[PDB]
UniProtKB/Swiss-Prot annotation, chain D:
Protein name: T-complex protein 1 subunit beta
Family affiliation: Belongs to the TCP-1 chaperonin family.
Oligomeric and partner information: Component of the chaperonin-containing T-complex (TRiC), a hexadecamer composed of two identical back-to-back stacked rings enclosing a protein folding chamber. Each ring is made up of eight different subunits: TCP1/CCT1, CCT2, CCT3, CCT4, CCT5, CCT6A/CCT6, CCT7, CCT8. Interacts with PACRG. Interacts with FLCN. Interacts with DLEC1. Interacts with SVEP1.
Lineage: Eukaryota, Metazoa, Chordata, Craniata, Vertebrata
Superkingdom classification of source: Eukaryota
Function: Component of the chaperonin-containing T-complex (TRiC), a molecular chaperone complex that assists the folding of actin, tubulin and other proteins upon ATP hydrolysis. The TRiC complex mediates the folding of WRAP53/TCAB1, thereby regulating telomere maintenance. As part of the TRiC complex may play a role in the assembly of BBSome, a complex involved in ciliogenesis regulating transports vesicles to the cilia.
Organism: Bos taurus
Gene: CCT2
Residues given in the record as ADP binding sites: E42, K47
Localization (cell): Cytoplasm
Binding site for ATP: E42, K47
Amino acid sequence: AGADEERAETARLSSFIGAIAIGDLVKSTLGPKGMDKILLSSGRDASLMVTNDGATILKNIGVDNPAAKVLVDMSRVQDDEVGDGTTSVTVLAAELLREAESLIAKKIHPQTIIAGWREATKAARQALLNSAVDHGSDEVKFRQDLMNIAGTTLSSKLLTHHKDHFTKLAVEAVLRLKGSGNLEAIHVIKKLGGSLADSYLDEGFLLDKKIGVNQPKRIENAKILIANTGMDTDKIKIFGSRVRVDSTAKVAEIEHAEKEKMKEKVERILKHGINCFINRQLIYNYPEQLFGAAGVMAIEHADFVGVERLALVTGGEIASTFDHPELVKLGSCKLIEEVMIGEDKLIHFSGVALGEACTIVLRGATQQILDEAERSLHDALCVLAQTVKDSRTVYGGGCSEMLMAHAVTQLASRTPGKEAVAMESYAKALRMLPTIIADNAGYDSADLVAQLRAAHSEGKTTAGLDMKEGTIGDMSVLGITESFQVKRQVLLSAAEAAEVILRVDNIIKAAPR
Amino acid sequence: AGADEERAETARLSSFIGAIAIGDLVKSTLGPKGMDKILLSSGRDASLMVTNDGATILKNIGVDNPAAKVLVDMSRVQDDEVGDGTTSVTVLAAELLREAESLIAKKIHPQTIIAGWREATKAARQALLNSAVDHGSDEVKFRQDLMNIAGTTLSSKLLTHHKDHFTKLAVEAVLRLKGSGNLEAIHVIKKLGGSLADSYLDEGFLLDKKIGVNQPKRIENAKILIANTGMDTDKIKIFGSRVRVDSTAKVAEIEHAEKEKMKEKVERILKHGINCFINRQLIYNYPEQLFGAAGVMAIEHADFVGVERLALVTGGEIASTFDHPELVKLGSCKLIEEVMIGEDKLIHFSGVALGEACTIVLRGATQQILDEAERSLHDALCVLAQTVKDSRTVYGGGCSEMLMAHAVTQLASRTPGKEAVAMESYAKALRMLPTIIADNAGYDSADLVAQLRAAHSEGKTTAGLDMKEGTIGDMSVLGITESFQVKRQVLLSAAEAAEVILRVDNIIKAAPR
Amino acid sequence: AGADEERAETARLSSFIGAIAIGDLVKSTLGPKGMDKILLSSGRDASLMVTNDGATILKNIGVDNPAAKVLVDMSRVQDDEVGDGTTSVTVLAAELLREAESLIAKKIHPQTIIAGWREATKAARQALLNSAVDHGSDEVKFRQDLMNIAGTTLSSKLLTHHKDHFTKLAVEAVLRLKGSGNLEAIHVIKKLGGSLADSYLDEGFLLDKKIGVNQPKRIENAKILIANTGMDTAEKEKMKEKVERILKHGINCFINRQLIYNYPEQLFGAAGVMAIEHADFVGVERLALVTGGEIASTFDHPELVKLGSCKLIEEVMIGEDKLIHFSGVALGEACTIVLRGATQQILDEAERSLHDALCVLAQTVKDSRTVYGGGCSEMLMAHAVTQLASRTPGKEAVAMESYAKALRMLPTIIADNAGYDSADLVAQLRAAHSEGKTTAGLDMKEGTIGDMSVLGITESFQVKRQVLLSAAEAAEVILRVDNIIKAAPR
Amino acid sequence: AGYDSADLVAQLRAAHSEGKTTAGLDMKEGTIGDMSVLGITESFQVKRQVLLSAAEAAEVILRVDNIIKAAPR
């Protein structure tokens, strides 16, 4: 069935090309001095999407014929049990393939070489579980909450001039999310006003709708009403028949029936003291005139998702027919008002006693990269959870990579036979990472490699690559650390990908045609 | 059918090229150590489908102009008659065309050579009852039920690490199946949940449909109702016309008339205790409200194929108009449930009194590899069913092929003149199979051929090609066996397929299945 | 998968080219002898917008692929804080990039050069809290209300031949603006011509609509009626209700915000009542505050529930065009400004000018600080910065002095538009600033140097301090970073 | 030399500024070292004549118009 034919060495080549193409784009992304990339396509894509996080862009698309989709799909499984922090796993896998050209010189049995992958697992354990770094992050935790891993995730991202503070804010958001719930009732919007904080944390939920031009500006000792059924009244399931009347006099009684709907709403709305009404769907016009005189602010076509969160927030209510007010509904009473922030008008729900559900409103510099705030925030919410229950960490800035490289090099040379050739190639793979981090900063990588290796080799796991410095320094002071899970499965995932050649013996070649 | 008339040297070539193209690809798929092939195509494909079933891919696509699609189409009837075993029938048919080149030197009448096939019938018959094969197949049986041929079918298949276990399951399915009633009511469906079994055996039938959002969660002592005619009512023939009425009050009587259809359905449904209703077509909306309150689960647009199998299973029913309930309907009553299986919801019918028909359900990790279960599963049903009816089998792994080759070599000297070279050529064709099996093993092919021939000549039928060994071994211990008629039909089919190529000048299509 | 991706060597060029293109158009718009520029784009631009305010034109359009829109966007935050005065901040940033070609000679690490930016912050505030500028202007002010900065904003603008009188008026507008209303209720309309004064400043609201050809020319002891519901709706009875309550009141004028039914129109003409069809809602809301407010609902709306101001409502001829003037509001909270000219293309420019007038005065009062314009600050700061490069050792000094030489061009840029010899101007300017006189600056009319203060040209303190911080704004960041093109939708 | 230029320029200027005439560029080192130990010295005349000569020769370039002659090579 069809066939772009490749076999033996050509089949190997497609794997080779896929790894190199992805390595260059992800290469600039790594580290506090990483680079943002904008990708533009056509059809079902809106504007140019720029994503700092490498995993998000790979998940979204499958651009071309060469094979790489299954390897890419792997990063997401990693993400579920840990994932992010900073991207790095994809880069290491690609460099494995470069030595394959050298394999041609041996010319016969690559399967024998495959023994190196078993060998690689030793590196995963020798580098890890010796020399203790950290251990707590138990729950809530008063000071440990942030100002460590979240900062590192953001450092790669451009926004860190003021956004390092924003990342700190995110843990407070995760702590309330902590508990019985899964991953719900979190809402984020950015604003064009300028402040040092650059963001506000809201006690309640943020909405943006208005009753109309008329009605009081704000309410005091506010009561909140939510209705499932619309304010619209007329036809019913069965009309009670079409109606014909012998003159304009009796048609008027129908109008009178309408007045009754108006009056019921005001008479006991007053009793509650109703200050605000929120309805999801179309709102009937008659009540609008009445609300303004009463001094009650209502919201037309409020989004349902905001409503469900709001119910958990105010103790909720049972929403049914107009009987819904008074006791059946519970309303929080701190402060509800429409206020101006910077240059625009929004409505704030706040002062909720329960406290489980909260809304965050971001403020920004006023750059397109401001849009990045939804992008950066989403990443922030789930980075911390991984830190909390992993309870294990490793030194960042390539500290781990140089150390492991030193250990693997000894293993290859020390052995005598064909055993040495296979193992040595795996060992040089770790060397490129030091190179990737130094080049991005603005310092030539040649000088950096020589000086870098000497500090890690001696035995200081704390020392790493300092880009601001241009040389080498203490990673721990910086506060950059990587989750323990990311290191154990990056090595395992890369190895089984090349394990597949081992698993399948012979590989005859191409298609029945 | 418009022309393209080709004769003798070129006409022969179109078939000759078709046979050589197919033979090399099918060649890699034989034996316990088969090779997976990936196919890439554009337009309504989507991705690479990895099939190691020599017949599944050939059926799926009719890629080009040359004649071979009908030859290929024929192998499926063979599957009906005896099944796949391991693909080999296509290979033997292709190889007799190879000596056609030798025949150009002969330079007389190609048709005269065609006589060798008349003798080929003798060769087919001599092979028959001289092989000395297995015995037993008593019925049901304790430990000879499987862990044999199904494993062999799957040995070449990638899924063997997990599927060897569920290949084992297939024979349990055949044992219940056997009796008087032909091959009917066997259904199996894939699932995306993961478990160390990869399959569940259902005592009843699996569907995948739901009544609607409302209705009781579970039914006990369930009764089954099947209706030929739809719930929908209105047009008929001799319409009664399209209507207008004198007061729009009489339109109401029409509405009332609909209610009568609803009432008949509820009044007699209640007496039975009706727990589930299955209809093969569109369902009218009014009854839907009724079923939920009653405590009855109904199925909208149930597929007819599922229903017929179910009827045999339940004990059947006489399907007519709404009079259909009570006695005219027979309903089994063990357990009908909608059961969540790790994720995707489905409906399970089970506990059938008859026992004649059953359904098999598959589970797995969730990847391209897990989807091969669908691929492997189709193969499993056919292999075992054939094993019971034939009551005869042959030794696999090439054991059958070498023995026959020794006998045919003698024959060429025996036959007169022109016949002798053609008969001789047929004999050497069998030689390639031993070579093909050895080469994929990773062992030197030349050494294998000589050693193989010596053991078959000796008289041990059990001895054959052992790929893991790299030499010749005992096939019976391995458990590789082929059904008796697979070899019996291939010899006759290859002979009648090869002859047609030289004899008919004008090809293309139209006729039987 | 991509688009135009640039880094280090080529990335710098994109920033470099954007800066040079902007500087030539902006330079011509500086101080007293600035030149007006016109840009026209065929799609969704409607008309030729003539802007002499540099910030307004850059914000409106993202013309092409090179990066500059984000740099431009920053100036608006400055506008909110203070903004304009005279545009000059953009020019300083552009010249910073010019020295970078020289930097390739170094062929080394751009980051080391970056230490200059930190140095710049030190340099930036030594121009601050040094060299005293002005006093007072805390609030309102009788004499000090204008005859100062507003004229300077106008100096760049040609209209100042008689415009400067107009700008004097604007501070009065801002003082009434102050209060709990924040930023609202200011309306400006220009009239074709016929007067030396060139503006009147209405205490009330100015409107432009007519009931129809018929109706009394003038109304006396006018009463105003505002209705939420339109006249549009047995028909005769509706006519009756409108007349029965109208006569007792003495109803002089009716204003309705929407469509008006034809039947009442005939009644109003005979009655002697002037009504306005489809009056804009924005005028009405402001008008209600002005009159004293009314309760607008159903036809019950007349008499007591509705309050009407009573000085005078009439349709008046202003030099030519027919208009309706609402005036005589005792409350005093809201006012409207009307401008007059001589029927000139340049007159349209007055519409441009008033909106910007509110912005300068509002922030000039809050900062309570100013700087000397005409490039006075630039040479002084340049003199101070040249010494600073020497103070810093080896590697730092070459880069620090390049920043210092950048300041040198500003004196030259002001001189060049004058028509005077650029070479001579640079040498003479430096000597006066070096000496220690802060009030001394570039006098374009003189062709040499003069006293800036006598002219009345001053620049807001806020623009100079913020610009120095933004004298950086990632110039430093741009070579340590790679991707920043951006806005221009899908 | 084959060493990074950026590090070299920064460090070189500090050494000379301090007051050691001996300190200079050491290419073999990759950093700045003591030139005097190396034994590298330049004749005194070459430095005094060049400064006087360069300026005078450069000066003729500006005040001289049309310096024509032969073909490119």
